[PDB]
Amino acid sequence: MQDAITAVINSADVQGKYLDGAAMDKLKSYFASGELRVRAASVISANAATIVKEAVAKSLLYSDVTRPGGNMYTTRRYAACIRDLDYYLRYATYAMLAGDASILDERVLNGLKETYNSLGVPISSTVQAIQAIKEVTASLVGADAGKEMGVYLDYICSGLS
Amino acid sequence: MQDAITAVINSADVQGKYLDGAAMDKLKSYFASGELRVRAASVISANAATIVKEAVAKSLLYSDVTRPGGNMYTTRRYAACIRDLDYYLRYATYAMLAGDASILDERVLNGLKETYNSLGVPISSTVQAIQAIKEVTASLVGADAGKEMGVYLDYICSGLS
Amino acid sequence: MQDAITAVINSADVQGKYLDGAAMDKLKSYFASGELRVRAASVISANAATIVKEAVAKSLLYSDVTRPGGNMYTTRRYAACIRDLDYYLRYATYAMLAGDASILDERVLNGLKETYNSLGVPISSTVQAIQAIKEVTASLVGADAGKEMGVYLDYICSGLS
Amino acid sequence: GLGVEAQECRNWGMQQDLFSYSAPFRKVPQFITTFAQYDRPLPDQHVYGSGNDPLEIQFGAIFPKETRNPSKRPAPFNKDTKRILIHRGPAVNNQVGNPSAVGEFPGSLGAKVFRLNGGLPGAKVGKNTGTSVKFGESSTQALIRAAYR
Amino acid sequence: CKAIEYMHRRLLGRPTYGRQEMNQYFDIASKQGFYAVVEAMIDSKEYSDAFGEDTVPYERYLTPGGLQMRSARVGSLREDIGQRVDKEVTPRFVELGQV
Amino acid sequence: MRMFRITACVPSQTRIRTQRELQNTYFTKLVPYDNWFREQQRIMKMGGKIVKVELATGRPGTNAGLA
Amino acid sequence: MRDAVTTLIKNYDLTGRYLDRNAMDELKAYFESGSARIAAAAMINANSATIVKRAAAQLFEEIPELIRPSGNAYTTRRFSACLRDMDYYLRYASYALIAADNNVLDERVLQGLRETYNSLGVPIGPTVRGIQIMKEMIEAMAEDSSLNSTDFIASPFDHMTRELSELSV
Amino acid sequence: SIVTKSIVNADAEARYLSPGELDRIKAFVTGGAARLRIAETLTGSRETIVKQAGDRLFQKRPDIVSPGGNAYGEEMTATCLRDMDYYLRLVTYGVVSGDVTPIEEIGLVGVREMYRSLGTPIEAVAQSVREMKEVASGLMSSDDAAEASAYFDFVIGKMS
Amino acid sequence: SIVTKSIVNADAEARYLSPGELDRIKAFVTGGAARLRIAETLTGSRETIVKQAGDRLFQKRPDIVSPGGNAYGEEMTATCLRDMDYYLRLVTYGVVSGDVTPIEEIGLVGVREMYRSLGTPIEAVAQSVREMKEVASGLMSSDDAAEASAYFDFVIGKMS
Amino acid sequence: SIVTKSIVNADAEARYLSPGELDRIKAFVTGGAARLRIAETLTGSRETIVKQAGDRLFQKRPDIVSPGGNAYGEEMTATCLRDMDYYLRLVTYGVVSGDVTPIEEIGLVGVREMYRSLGTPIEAVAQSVREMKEVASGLMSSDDAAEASAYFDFVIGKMS
Amino acid sequence: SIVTKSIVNADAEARYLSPGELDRIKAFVTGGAARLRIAETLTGSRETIVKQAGDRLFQKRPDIVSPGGNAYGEEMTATCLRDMDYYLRLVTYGVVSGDVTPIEEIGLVGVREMYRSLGTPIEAVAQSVREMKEVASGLMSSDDAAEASAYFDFVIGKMS
């Protein structure tokens, strides 16, 4: 994967130059945001289960998905949906800490759409669930870190679509 | 699509030999059932729209599906749901006349799952609607032809599974 | 696609509610911003080619991208890149006029990331070019309209990267 | 491999693709996808393969390259297998169930339609030369450019 | 086959239903060539019905994958597509105490 | 190549169109020789009346050089 | 894999229904057929190897080229592999007869048969011909034996034929 | 919405919005106050309009509500009035948008199929919308009534 | 089969099976016994019908067995009679199913391109089909001779 | 029952069952399967049949449902529908029994006197039964509709 | 006409008629005698059917013949009966041809527009067609009535 530091380093290296002022400004910005990133990561780690619980209750429960014939009917299938939401929240936190949506691309999105297409998972409804997760995380972490988390959550949704 | 007769002829052709006694037995069994199949098909064809009306009244009307926020809410989506029920009834009639689900695989259940997933169609709601269609058709056609039709209707529902 | 008015109306329709005070306030805000949006759209339509020319000069020209071995090497590739930037500017203008990014998602960003990945188009270079377009448009249009155009151009950048 | 022991006829192509050194480059899971696809019916997919469906973008024949990031998803499509295509216009206008509605136009639900509804400039000698402001020529120019697009 | 599929999508606004159409245009391509394949697609009766002698073709059908790519992003995703939309209502006590 | 200038009148039979249809109702077009047979077949199947047909390009009985 | 009872249960659970009168009737039919199912399975177990050997000894006479040059059973190695496939067909057909459902047949036989056989160059027509020969031998032996019910035996083999057979028409 | 329609057209010809289209959009944006006023009037007097139009329609077409009719019964009449309320809401949406696109998308595509399936007389529903239009026109001045009459007549013509 | 043809036409028209189509299927299911009798007679006279038709074709066109002919040699003659048997079996399937589709898909669509590669005279094979038709008519009752002759002549016309 | 009628005719002459009456009994037993198919269709469609027939009657004869009519009022309308259900059930009994004796014994002896006492138009009741006949015959094949038409016409004649 | 449809399909596919199509043609020609008998019964009973259905429709919807209605007056009543006669003749054409093609071509395309122009209620026209169907079915045998019911219901459904 790649964080902001490794991303800027690779961008400089691929063209073969040292770190100039422009790159150093990006690193300074990342260092400025590091404290907020760590606080948000701690909060999300504390409230991981509650976030997914509230998102599921707000988007999926009592819909067509949970009723018989839906893709969340069996208890195993419900637990699988919960596990998918856990992945999405945890990897969104990872990308928020790293300041780069590369771990999401190389460990959550590359082929996930194919897997859901094979399994029949409703991509639109999982996008709605991820949006609910975004809303809950924003409410629990604050606007400044909530927007950053929502950036990577929307990245995951766009990759899924 | 392959009916019972085309299925027998295909099984004989792929072996290169002529229709022996077993093939004639299968053909005459299908012909014997043909009278019941034709009667049921003609009755369903005559009472095509009424069956869909009864199924929709029994399953989807006055529900959250048809209320605002439901996929069967807008008039265009209501018309589309009605047309889908018409498809299921007509193709069940086709499969009853042919003694096979091959048409259901080729034309009906071909891409239908992700088609509804992309469209946002409630799979459990459509399954319940197809069940209502099956029960209404069974009532209107009789126990035997009703069960025969229900075979293909349950095939469609299990395909949606 | 949905503008601000259609977005508000759809939000009301989904809950099956008449336009209440909050929806009317949102519509009033959009109507207030309409004059600024129209003026910015007219300015951008007038200075369409100039904006793209200045952005490509600022961010792309005289670089490895335009030199042999770069993506914008051949005249055909230069023309293609200019056309892509023109499409981005035009659709950003559409999004600014509508007050919504639905058109951007529906007609621009759908599969754009996959398209550049298959083609080999440098995503970082394209993002920098769009950033240059945003700065040029801001300088050429003003503060508030420039900010709105920057919002939609950054939406395109987020979708692309 | 094939000769080391008995190979079950359920993961043949899967394990054939897995054993080759190109395995770490097909990033799309070829095992769970096919295992689900066995239990599920035929997918939304071109008859001749998943790589044979272009992207639904405005322009460009963007195809999944069979060798770059391997994602082939073959399916057993026989001859008489019609596809399900979502109509741009009203759902009732789909010619599958509305075969006489092919000429319908998708008002506000599908893409815009271009026709030679207006008379082409110079079609008749009613405009006896001159007439520099003969109004209908931008319409036909837009029609030609739209046919190009 | 990819070329013929894109050509059909382009000249009728419709992905090919499947192997019957693909076989027809494929035999055309093998026997006569690009020109005759284009001629066949233009002169097919479906083209005549969908577009007369005066109508430019347009995208008439979308595959489910393309439709999902278009209408499944965070933007352009309807609130009610794959989600339980709870009708928001003011609290009963707020209504009771309201003047 | 040999070209046919054809004028024909093709009426509508199934639906009462409310858009301007005179242009494709009565028209003249330059169809190629290699397409003339199928165009004539289409017009006849649609029910049109072939008012006139002329060989605008080329000359009759051209053994070679008809391209 | 799913037998008839499990497939019925899954079908009803799909709609979220309780087992109705039709479900009870289908279950009763299967449970009454179970005696003949066990009988046929015992008979095929008794005569298994002989059945496959006789089926091969008829199929190589029906299509003689499978043992001549360029045939697919030319070596003794190829011959033993072909007989192994035939034994696999018989064993899974027996399992399907006892289970009264062809899903156990599908999950473990047909789901990649064409891919594997095409990769190895095996014909896909002679194999189904041998399958039908085995089915004929099985049903003839059952009819000779004291099996009151024998109709179900043709179902698994015929499903194998329909699935693994090329769509001629 | 006129803005959405203009943007869609400009996209279809792959060009920036014409000066005429921009002028039309600016005119609509300026005139939106009257549209909001009309929508507020209809929303405020929705229940009265629905009730009066329902009574007038029932008197004009007694059979639909008499026994054996589609709308006979208290709950059936409640559903009929709910349909009328739905169409009033759609008319308000159309008034706010300035275009009949929301009305056509939500409650005019497949309306004939829906009502034929339900057994409800489509001409009866059109007459109900006509009664609603008359009541609404009475409940506002000529200018606002004239504006709303466009959407009312559009719905009536589509139903007919 | 006739059922498949009717179902395909009805599906293409997006409708249910016509009353006439249903009556045709009724008549076919009633006459299934007679058509099974026809097919069983053909299967009985299999090794005789093809042999006699091939004999008559050879005596009509010596070039096929003459030097420079397509079927020169005993192996080629045996393969020619194999094609004879294949077409007779196809006709059996067609008369059983009441539809030419099982005949055409297995052995009619693209048959000219299949036999151009082999260099066999298409009109020669059509003559062979004709001769098989007369042999079957001779070994067949009057009315069912006409019934099978319809399909035989269809194959003759499509291949020749 | 046809069995009842034949056995009674035999006993009235004190002989065993005649060959003709045994022929009639055999025909009745053979047609019993079609009888049950018709009866099951009727009982399954009892709700829809009664509802549609009641709607048709209340449309054709609004006098009976208008104020001052016998069926006026919610309870009176429900009772009229219940009588329609009673006569449909009797029709099913006659269909199963192969005659109209159950209909006669249960709901066609003294019906004129009973409906005179209740104040009902016997012609209106006959019209209701005729509409039930039309609705039911629309839900089955040609032969079955003709079969049920006999019982329906018998009820119509006994009522008018 | 089934002959017309088969020939059109054969031309469109550019080949001679299939054996199944010829079988359909011969079966249709065989049934042409019964179709002609049905048409003769209808044309003989045109006057009585027209008068009875018109009177029943007038009773059902007296407003149509009431003053201020479209059918009010002797001339308007005569034209209404002329339309009834025209539609009955079209139904006879359909029964003779075995298809609704002549009816659709002559008097069932643009009918909604033409009655909107003339002010006539399409609902009243459909109800009148239903009354004509009921009268004809009562006057004709059940099987023949069932056959004509296809054309009558097609006309009614296209009206509504």
Ligand SMILES: *[C@H](C)[C@H]1/C(=C/c2[nH]c(/C=C3N=C(/C=C4\NC(=O)C(CC)=C4C)C(C)=C\3CCC(=O)O)c(CCC(=O)O)c2C)NC(=O)[C@@H]1C
């Ligand atoms: C009752 C004994 C206990 C209890 C029940 C309870 N459950 C819910 C909500 C749900 N229950 C389920 C469970 C299942 N769905 C399935 O399909 C399966 C297998 C067939 C199971 C086991 C689900 C999915 C839900 C979510 C809602 C939904 O059904 O869509 C609730 C409500 C929870 C809430 O806050 O909404 C309750 C109360 N509660 C107790 O205290 C008992 C011990």
Ligand SMILES: *[C@H](C)[C@H]1/C(=C/c2[nH]c(/C=C3N=C(/C=C4\NC(=O)C(CC)=C4C)C(C)=C\3CCC(=O)O)c(CCC(=O)O)c2C)NC(=O)[C@@H]1C
């Ligand atoms: C009704 C029981 C459920 C329901 C239906 C619904 N469907 C659509 C849209 C479409 N339905 C189909 C389906 C088919 N087309 C076919 O050709 C066949 C196979 C022969 C099928 C099954 C398609 C393709 C569409 C898209 C439009 C088109 O037909 O081309 C909608 C509308 C969705 C929208 O957003 O417009 C709806 C509502 N909805 C429910 O809630 C029921 C469970």
Ligand SMILES: *[C@H](C)[C@H]1/C(=C/c2[nH]c(/C=C3N=C(/C=C4\NC(=O)C(CC)=C4C)C(C)=C\3CCC(=O)O)c(CCC(=O)O)c2C)NC(=O)[C@@H]1C
């Ligand atoms: C310019 C900022 C960068 C760049 C551009 C570039 N693009 C192409 C080729 C294509 N671009 C597209 C893009 C789109 N198609 C759509 O429908 C839309 C949605 C609105 C977009 C944005 C496509 C499809 C192509 C394919 C070729 C074609 O034009 O049809 C090229 C040339 C590719 C080639 O090899 O021909 C280039 C150069 N390149 C850069 O380096 C810039 C960063």
Ligand SMILES: *[C@H](C)[C@H]1/C(=C/c2[nH]c(/C=C3N=C(/C=C4\NC(=O)C(CC)=C4C)C(C)=C\3CCC(=O)O)c(CCC(=O)O)c2C)NC(=O)[C@@H]1C
């Ligand atoms: C012959 C040497 C071997 C063989 C081939 C075979 N192929 C098909 C069917 C198809 N083959 C193709 C081929 C191509 N598609 C492409 O795009 C390209 C060029 C870029 C090629 C070469 C296609 C498209 C089809 C489908 C045709 C159709 O849809 O009708 C068949 C017949 C399949 C069928 O069911 O009709 C065969 C037999 N098979 C062998 O066993 C030979 C070794």
Ligand SMILES: *[C@H](C)[C@H]1/C(=C/c2[nH]c(/C=C3N=C(/C=C4\NC(=O)C(CC)=C4C)C(C)=C\3CCC(=O)O)c(CCC(=O)O)c2C)NC(=O)[C@@H]1C
């Ligand atoms: C009515 C006053 C007279 C009449 C009408 C009538 N017209 C047709 C057929 C056509 N009419 C037109 C005319 C136009 N089409 C256009 O687009 C415009 C220009 C904007 C005009 C004036 C055309 C082109 C046709 C051809 C068919 C078609 O409409 O597509 C008919 C016959 C229709 C048919 O198919 O038979 C009739 C009856 N007839 C009278 O007797 C009146 C004097």
Ligand SMILES: *[C@H](C)[C@H]1/C(=C/c2[nH]c(/C=C3N=C(/C=C4\NC(=O)C(CC)=C4C)C(C)=C\3CCC(=O)O)c(CCC(=O)O)c2C)NC(=O)[C@@H]1C
């Ligand atoms: C007996 C004195 C002689 C004899 C007769 C015989 N063989 C078979 C059957 C087979 N024989 C073979 C032969 C070979 N397989 C190999 O791989 C090799 C290469 C070294 C050889 C020579 C095979 C493949 C078969 C099976 C297929 C077949 O039917 O031919 C039979 C028939 C047995 C039966 O009917 O079941 C007989 C009578 N074989 C000898 O080796 C002796 C010289």
Ligand SMILES: *[C@H](C)[C@H]1/C(=C/c2[nH]c(/C=C3N=C(/C=C4\NC(=O)C(CC)=C4C)C(C)=C\3CCC(=O)O)c(CCC(=O)O)c2C)NC(=O)[C@@H]1C
């Ligand atoms: C015999 C009737 C025909 C025949 C057979 C033949 N098969 C192979 C090789 C394999 N056969 C299979 C099949 C299966 N494996 C399974 O697990 C299942 C279900 C349980 C089936 C049906 C497989 C996987 C192989 C290869 C792997 C293996 O055997 O372990 C051969 C070998 C060919 C060669 O040259 O090696 C042969 C000969 N051959 C004929 O001619 C008959 C028509």
Ligand SMILES: *[C@H](C)[C@H]1/C(=C/c2[nH]c(/C=C3N=C(/C=C4\NC(=O)C(CC)=C4C)C(C)=C\3CCC(=O)O)c(CCC(=O)O)c2C)NC(=O)[C@@H]1C
């Ligand atoms: C009243 C003027 C007419 C009338 C009304 C009536 N409607 C129903 C049932 C339904 N009406 C609708 C219509 C809509 N739903 C929507 O979301 C919209 C688009 C915005 C419309 C137009 C629907 C979907 C139903 C189904 C029931 C449900 O809503 O869940 C009835 C009852 C029908 C029945 O028998 O159940 C009635 C009576 N009836 C008349 O006669 C008037 C002309």
Ligand SMILES: *[C@H](C)[C@H]1/C(=C/c2[nH]c(/C=C3N=C(/C=C4\NC(=O)C(CC)=C4C)C(C)=C\3CCC(=O)O)c(CCC(=O)O)c2C)NC(=O)[C@@H]1C
């Ligand atoms: C009677 C059941 C209904 C009815 C009748 C009515 N019709 C007219 C006038 C016309 N009707 C037609 C229709 C046709 N003419 C044809 O040639 C055919 C082709 C099959 C049809 C269907 C026409 C053309 C007219 C115009 C006059 C004329 O015939 O030349 C009227 C008079 C309308 C007026 O205001 O003058 C009436 C009353 N009216 C009803 O309400 C019944 C449902």
Ligand SMILES: CCC1=C(C)/C(=C/C2=NC(=C\c3[nH]c(/C=C4\NC(=O)[C@H](C)[C@H]4CC)c(C)c3CCC(=O)O)/C(CCC(=O)O)=C2C)NC1=O
């Ligand atoms: C291999 C094909 C190919 C072509 C054609 C090409 C052209 C080309 N010429 C450029 C600039 C330029 N080209 C010229 C040259 C000219 N000034 C004049 O007056 C003359 C008419 C003309 C030369 C005869 C100039 C002056 C610029 C600079 C433009 C500017 O900086 O504004 C640029 C952008 C700057 C850059 O090179 O990075 C390109 C891409 N590049 C390619 O790879």
